[PDB]
Amino acid sequence: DQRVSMPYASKGLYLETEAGYYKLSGEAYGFVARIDGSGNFQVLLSDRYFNKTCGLCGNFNIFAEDDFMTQEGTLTSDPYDFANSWALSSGEQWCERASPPSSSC
Amino acid sequence: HSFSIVIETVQCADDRDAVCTRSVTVRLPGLHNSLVKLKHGAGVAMDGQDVQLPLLKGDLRIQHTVTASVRLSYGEDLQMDWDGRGRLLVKLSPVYAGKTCGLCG
Amino acid sequence: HSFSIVIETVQCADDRDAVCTRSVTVRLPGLHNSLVKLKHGAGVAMDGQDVQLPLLKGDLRIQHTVTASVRLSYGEDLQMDWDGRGRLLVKLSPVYAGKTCGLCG
Amino acid sequence: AACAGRGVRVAWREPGRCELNCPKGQVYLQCGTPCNLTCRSLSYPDEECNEACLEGCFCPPGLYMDERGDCVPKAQCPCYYDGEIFQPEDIFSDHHTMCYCEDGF
Numbered sequence: 001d002q003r004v005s006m007p008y009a010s011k012g013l014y015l016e017t018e019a020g021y022y023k024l025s026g027e028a029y030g031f032v033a034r035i036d037g038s039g040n041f042q043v044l045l046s047d048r049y050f051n052k053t054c055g056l057c058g059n060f061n062i063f064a065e066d067d068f069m070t071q072e073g074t075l076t077s078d079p080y081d082f083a084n085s086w087a088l089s090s091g092e093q094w095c096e097r098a099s100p101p102s103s104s105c
Numbered sequence: 106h107s108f109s110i111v112i113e114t115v116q117c118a119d120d121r122d123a124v125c126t127r128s129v130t131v132r133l134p135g136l137h138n139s140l141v142k143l144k145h146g147a148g149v150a151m152d153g154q155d156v157q158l159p160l161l162k163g164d165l166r167i168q169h170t171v172t173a174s175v176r177l178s179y180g181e182d183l184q185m186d187w188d189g190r191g192r193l194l195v196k197l198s199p200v201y202a203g204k205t206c207g208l209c210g
Numbered sequence: 211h212s213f214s215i216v217i218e219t220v221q222c223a224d225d226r227d228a229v230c231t232r233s234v235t236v237r238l239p240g241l242h243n244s245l246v247k248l249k250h251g252a253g254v255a256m257d258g259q260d261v262q263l264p265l266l267k268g269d270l271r272i273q274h275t276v277t278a279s280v281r282l283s284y285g286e287d288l289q290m291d292w293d294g295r296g297r298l299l300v301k302l303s304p305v306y307a308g309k310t311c312g313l314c315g
Numbered sequence: 316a317a318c319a320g321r322g323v324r325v326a327w328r329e330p331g332r333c334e335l336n337c338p339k340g341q342v343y344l345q346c347g348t349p350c351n352l353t354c355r356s357l358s359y360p361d362e363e364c365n366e367a368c369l370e371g372c373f374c375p376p377g378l379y380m381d382e383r384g385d386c387v388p389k390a391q392c393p394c395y396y397d398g399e400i401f402q403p404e405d406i407f408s409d410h411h412t413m414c415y416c417e418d419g420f
């Protein structure tokens with residue numbers, strides 16, 4: 001809960017600027033992540049996590065269509081059932097099931 | 106076999122480890138083999154009929170607790186208290202001491 | 211003999227001329243000879259057992275009217291509406307025209 | 316009621332006689348539609364219902380009627396499944412199905 005200045009490094013994570021963008025590396029654990037100036041996230045996993053990961057970024061295997069695996073372990077055809085299945089509440093807030101926005105295109 | 110109590114367990118969240126009792130079923134061979142189901146939301150059914158509480162039927166009594174929990178009694182020797190949210194308390198008199206089996210030993 | 215409706219009439223004041231229906235009984239031979247009693251205060255019992263009113267088993271349906279009156283249906287061809295205060299309305303489809311007997315002709 | 320059976324609706328009630336005073340949160344209507352009053356109507360939205368507009372006590376136009384007789388927004392209605400009652404945002408998951416309660420369905 002404490003604000004900390006960049007660059008930073010603790011517990012084997014390194015948090016720094018790279019190419020003008022905010023970077024958060026943990027290749028001891030086997031990942032690295034970044035936020036660009038537009039606010040786009042990205043995450044990279046080492047092959048250590050192939051077919052051994054889950055969440056909104058999918059399950060990391062040769063198939064693309066066996067993603068959307070829920071925490072209940074089912075597939076779903078609905079991205080919002082998948083993503084809400086991976087929602088994590090906390091003492092800071094307990095969170096509602098999100099739904100698609102309205103459209104008129 | 107004067108009584109049997111069965112519980113239905115379900116995964117009560119998207120979390121794998123969040124498993125809880127959804128419903129309870131009680132079989133009473135001495136009461137013409139009545140089958141009593143205590144349901145989610147503190148409802149009750151008997152032989153598949155949705156009964157209205159309070160109920161008295163020979164040795165069997167079923168009543169709403171001030172907690173809105175369903176309380177069931179079968180004589181003075183068996184009592185149960187079902188909250189409708191997966192909490193079940195079962196009380197046996199010492200008449201049953203050493204005589205039980207199931208998950209409660 | 212697909213249905214039979216019976217009324218229990220009682221003296222309903224100190225007057226000898228104040229007589230009203232206390233309860234109603236419906237026998238349904240097609241519904242495995244079920245007996246449905248419509249009680250004072252708009253309760254219902256089936257085969258002597260008090261039931262939670264929204265009931266839909268077989269051709270029989272029983273429901274709370276917005277008036278809090280009991281409504282009963284038995285296919286399309288019989289309907290009843292019991293206020294619990296001695297008012298009973300019985301509707302039959304023309305399938306029963308000429309076939310009825312009792313106080314309603 | 317005989318008038319309404321012939322399709323004539325009479326504003327006969329007044330503060331000097333026979334006001335149909337409702338429980339708190341409900342409002343009187345000389346004619347309201349029954350088919351969408353209860354939370355069960357949300358929970359079984361494919362059910363057949365053709366019943367005419369009728370006199371009674373109804374929830375205000377945006378609210379549904381709960382088991383307590385209180386009036387609740389659609390998001391606050393319980394859900395009814397297999398004749399068994401679930402609260403808003405309840406989850407259950409099982410080897411046959413995985414389901415959740417939202418908007419009373």
Ligand SMILES: *[C@@H]1O[C@H](CO)[C@@H](O)[C@H](O)[C@H]1NC(C)=O
Nearest residue numbers: 050051052059060061062063
């Ligand atoms: C991924 O893991 C599952 C077990 O969870 C296994 O059945 C499957 O064969 C694995 N796929 C690959 C490509 O290793």
Ligand SMILES: *[C@@H]1O[C@H](CO)[C@@H](O)[C@H](O)[C@H]1NC(C)=O
Nearest residue numbers: 348351352375376377378379
């Ligand atoms: C029920 O339907 C009527 C239209 O027939 C509508 O005016 C009313 O708002 C509806 N009730 C609810 C709670 O949406």
Ligand SMILES: [Ca+2]
Nearest residue numbers: 061063064067
């Ligand atoms: Ca995949």
